[PDB]
Amino acid sequence: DWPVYHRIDGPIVMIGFGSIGRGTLPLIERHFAFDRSKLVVIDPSDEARKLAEARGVRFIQQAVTRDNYRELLVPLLTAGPGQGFCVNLSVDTSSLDIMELARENGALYIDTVVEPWLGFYFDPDLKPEARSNYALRETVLAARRNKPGGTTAVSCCGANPGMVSWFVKQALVNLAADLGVTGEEPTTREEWARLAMDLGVKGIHIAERDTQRASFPKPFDVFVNTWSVEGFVSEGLQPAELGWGTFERWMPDNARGHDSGCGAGIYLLQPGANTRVRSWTPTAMAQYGFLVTHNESISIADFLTVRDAAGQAVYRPTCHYAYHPCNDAVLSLHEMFGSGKRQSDWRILDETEIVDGIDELGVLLYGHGKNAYWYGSQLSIEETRRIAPDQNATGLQVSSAVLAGMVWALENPNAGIVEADDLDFRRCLEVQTPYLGPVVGVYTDWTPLAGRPGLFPEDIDTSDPWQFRNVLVR
Amino acid sequence: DWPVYHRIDGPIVMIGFGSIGRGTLPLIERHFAFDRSKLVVIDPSDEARKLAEARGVRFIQQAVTRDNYRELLVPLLTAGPGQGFCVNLSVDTSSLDIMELARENGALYIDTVVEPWLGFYFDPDLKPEARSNYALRETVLAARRNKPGGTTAVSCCGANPGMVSWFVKQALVNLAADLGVTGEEPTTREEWARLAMDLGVKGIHIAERDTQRASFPKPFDVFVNTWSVEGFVSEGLQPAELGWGTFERWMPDNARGHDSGCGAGIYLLQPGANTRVRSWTPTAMAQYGFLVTHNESISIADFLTVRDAAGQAVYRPTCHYAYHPCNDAVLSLHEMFGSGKRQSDWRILDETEIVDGIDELGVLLYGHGKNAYWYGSQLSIEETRRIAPDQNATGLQVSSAVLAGMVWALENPNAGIVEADDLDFRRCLEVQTPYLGPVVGVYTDWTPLAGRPGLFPEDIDTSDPWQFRNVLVR
Ligand SMILES: NC(=O)c1ccc[n+]([C@@H]2O[C@H](COP(=O)([O-])OP(=O)(O)OC[C@H]3O[C@@H](n4cnc5c(N)ncnc54)[C@H](O)[C@@H]3O)[C@@H](O)[C@H]2O)c1
Ligand SMILES: NC(=O)c1ccc[n+]([C@@H]2O[C@H](COP(=O)([O-])OP(=O)(O)OC[C@H]3O[C@@H](n4cnc5c(N)ncnc54)[C@H](O)[C@@H]3O)[C@@H](O)[C@H]2O)c1
């Protein structure tokens, strides 16, 4: 039967009960020991309230805001007898501020995104740079520098960001092994970074194809998705963003860097969900992905940076999302950008509404001796239904990653603010793998120059197929 | 009961029996008197053969080619008694060569496209300019100059090109009435061009939204459309192309003109089916269309050109396609361009497969005192099934236009080579309108600058919303 990993000795406060909350709650109940009355869910939605009442869980129907979060969360997280756990799966709330509050009060914390308080994403007085995930991530890095160590808080530990950081480490180990390179696997950041450099990894796509289909066709003027519509549109409207490799020799005219921070990122002055890149997955083969900004695009490139004695970067991989969402979400983006405004309505596909499909989610390492290697999960909706309730394949990859992060935080409770790249990737994947369906590594000889140039002139670099110049759809 | 317009006493030679041929044959049998035995269908496919045999129509299973078309077609065209009619609804055949052969033998001719002999659309030695619909149309204009008058041959008389020319004339008439512009209805090309100028029509979109949906979801690696997949992909991979208005102040860097010809066009060094434009239809409201090359983009702009004494163009409207095909076709394009190659299979949706939807097809006249005016057909699949067999709503708009052109040609059989713009639009709409469902004119305050600029800097022209600079998706 199911492993019980740990006792939680205090309140469990779940903030948000949308698609990921609904998928995560049963895993928390499944895999942790605690008094049922210790758990409470906070969400402003009536829909969420009715579901929570049906599950028999405590529910507080309230939006967490800048104005009320201290008054609301501090008593709940410190109810005792010991250390509680704040599980933040919301939108419109500040990850940074709630995280800092949890840490001040000795409660563990996990989220799946660096979310700002409501109002941030569409503030007209904000420059595009300030709306970037690079900038949000830097607030977390600064918080860590200001308060090193202390109670563990896990930032951005979903499927992506989150799990895919663990896939990158496993992929690097697999590439090395497949070359006949034997020896101790890296243990430090510097060793991982040098492994990527030594293997000649030029860059990484977070290469995803969602093939989940609904029993009903896409309705006119309804945005459809397999996870948060609000969250997807939000990130989709942020600037296109990528971790920027040292091998790159070209960037578009509307690309910009950053004055400060870890130094690993650029962004484009255009929305990521209307930016296309040429990419590849085992089931899709060659496909367009959208260049949607993601925390791990920066965090992985940062993690895998090799610096010289002077502190200058001598190696860093390119890293970015290449997202092909479900067909109805592709159509939803076409409708939204085509109308110049958000649809009147939206819906997230429930498992009962999905006829078939998978969420194929992995990391595509390219530029090395075997050209390209994809490593990740091919979780189907059929398998999902067999092993976890109240979610689709997309949800389960995320909720199981939150599970793994919670297990790691409980096992390593004095580690301070950490990213998915900081966790024991083997332990996390050990906890998560029961919920990931097939997990496979696949080589391909495909490159962004396959079939090019065609019948029109193209600005391409034939000496280096994986240059962003060739990947970006222009 | 249905009107029988004329008796056809000679052979009726239908070249091609795909989606449009299948929809047109029943209309021909319905609306003309002739012995069924004088009908002959020529198509290389087994599928076409089985369908023709089921209809009891003579069938020749041959591909018409540059090598055989004279030997194959001349005896069919001249079998008598009296004048034959060549109804050309094929792919991979030269419209020009077959047209000249019909004329040389005294047979009437109609088609729905200026198609080249097989090999042209992907000939690697052709310059982009030579692959343009402008260049193909010039071969027809040259033929007309070379042999003025003579037997009627109707070039490009489907739904679009074809019907939309008649919609432009009716729209201009409606606009004049609404804008209070006085004068007699134009009766010459020169008078039409002057009316468009006097109304201040800056440009015209062929503004289409197809909402037909199938009872099955789009299959992976299958291109799905409501009409010719081969024909759609061929034109989609031709350069983006537009009739170019005198009001335009900007063209993109990869835009090019023509050294010779009528002078009304430009093209872009990129495929039209992967080129988006901001447009509008009554059912879609604001939407993306694809800037797919079309004969009427050039023919309508050329037709509405006003010249001074020197022969210099002083007024010309912009004119181009702004096509939003059915959702499964939108997905098919994303798949094809994302993979960089055609799908391994394709299918055209049958009326028996379509669960609902319309083919909303009209002309959007803009820049005048009432901003924009859309005029056209909103034909539904439900209505289509009630009034015509063996076709969906897209098919019926095309087949009924072919019917109209055939009636016109019989009533005007010595008019020489003509385009849809040369036909009497009232007579043609009188024949076609019973098959068009609701035909409506709608005004809108929408412009391409609606909601712009937004979150990111945009290269827009704020002085004139309808500039191509604002329409083209960059
Ligand atoms: N790392 C990853 O892989 C990953 C994957 C999916 C989702 N996410 C993130 O997880 C979060 C949730 O995703 P989802 O699919 O569950 O979203 P969702 O849209 O389905 O649900 C969001 C929930 O948050 C609630 N909410 C809104 N304002 C709130 C407030 N002030 N306080 C508390 N709750 C509030 C809503 O009522 C809703 O029920 C999002 O922020 C999303 O970006 C991360
Ligand atoms: N103006 C318009 O509005 C409009 C609209 C639709 C279609 N069209 C055009 O009309 C034509 C037909 O469209 P469709 O939907 O019927 O196409 P389709 O693909 O369904 O059918 C094309 C037919 O042509 C046949 N064919 C191929 N090679 C041939 C040859 N060498 N000789 C004779 N026949 C041959 C095929 O076997 C097939 O049955 C296409 O060229 C298309 O572009 C125009």
Residue numbers in the entry:
A (entry chain A), B (entry chain B): 3 to 476
What does the paper say about this structure?
The entry to the pocket is formed by part of the “track-and-trace” loop (residues Phe-122 to Asp-125) and the α-helix J at the protein surface. The active site is situated between residues Asn-162, Trp-229, Glu-237, His-296, and the nicotine amide ring of NAD+ at the narrow end of the pocket. Narrowing might occur by the bending of the “track-and-trace” loop resulting in a slight rotation of the side chain of Tyr-123 deeper into the pocket and towards Glu-117, accompanied by a side chain rotation of Ser-236 towards the pocket entrance. Thus, the ellipsoid-shaped pore is narrowed from an approximately 4.0 Å times 5.0 Å opening to an approximately 3.3 Å times 3.5 Å opening. Slightly different relative orientations of subunit A to subunit B were observed for all BvHSS structures.
In contrast to its eukaryotic counterparts, bacterial HSS synthesizes 1 mol HSP from 2 mol PUT.
